[PDB]
């Protein structure tokens, strides 16, 4: 009975920790790439102002980053609704921004870029928070697991 | 002897995991804020091109983000040399960029911004990688801990 509970605990704690860790091996990547969307968005305005030849390539590059695996992989049952919903919004905002950029519309860009980037900012923040809650969970269960086993062994040994 | 090894293992595994996790509760924040430096850098060029009144505020805002606690806290013995060294570079590059921005020097900006942002990019990538190695470690020890205890209990029970 004593050892059964020690193994059960070791398997549960280790299992949940690894399952959460496995769903977090790309949290940092996501935050980086989501983050970059902000720079790319302002770099587009900078291209539009300097008449850079690179405008169209950056347009498509932003689109590619937006729809990167890591970010598309956020549309899964276990990723909170807030993250998936913010992502979806970004995806809609981009269509307008891109269309505006194709029509050379700097005045609309100047007027909207702050809000536009603020939204990306919120998204990135949600990823940040999400990644922290999960890391916390790992902490709580790794802790409780080491404590539980220490307690089970303390009484059993006694 | 059997239970002594089961507790020792539970304490080691849990200890190292928590110690690594504790040194990673702000990995996501770091990547976000380091990431933002990229956007802020291009937003500065955009201000400089549009003659925005916000130029000076963004200059100082970038400086404040650059020197944020989370990022200054990277200068510690247990953070790899590569991260601390890239950070230091950013800190030097900013002084030139800021001085150039004060003298209204768009031509130098246009010519250097890509390289300048590429460096921030590398920094952010190093933070990303660093955060992943640590998360891996947590995975490896949480795993080995649950396995070790399962094995210790299997033989002891047998």
From Swiss-Prot, chains A, B:
Localization terms from the record: Cell inner membrane
Gene Ontology biological-process entries: cellular response to nitrate; cellular response to nitrite; nitrate assimilation; signal transduction
Residue numbers on the Periplasmic membrane side: 23-134
Record keywords, A-Z: ATP-binding, Cell inner membrane, Cell membrane, Kinase, Membrane, Nitrate assimilation, Nucleotide-binding, Phosphoprotein, Transferase, Transmembrane, Transmembrane helix, Two-component regulatory system
Membrane-crossing segments per the record: 2-22, 135-155
GO cellular component: plasma membrane
GO function terms (MF aspect): ATP binding; phosphorelay sensor kinase activity; protein dimerization activity
Known function: Acts as a sensor for nitrate/nitrite and transduces signal of nitrate/nitrite availability to the NarL/NarP proteins. NarQ probably activates NarL and NarP by phosphorylation. NarQ probably negatively regulates the NarL protein by dephosphorylation.
Name this polypeptide is given: Nitrate/nitrite sensor protein NarQ
Range of the intact protein held here: 13 to 170 of 566
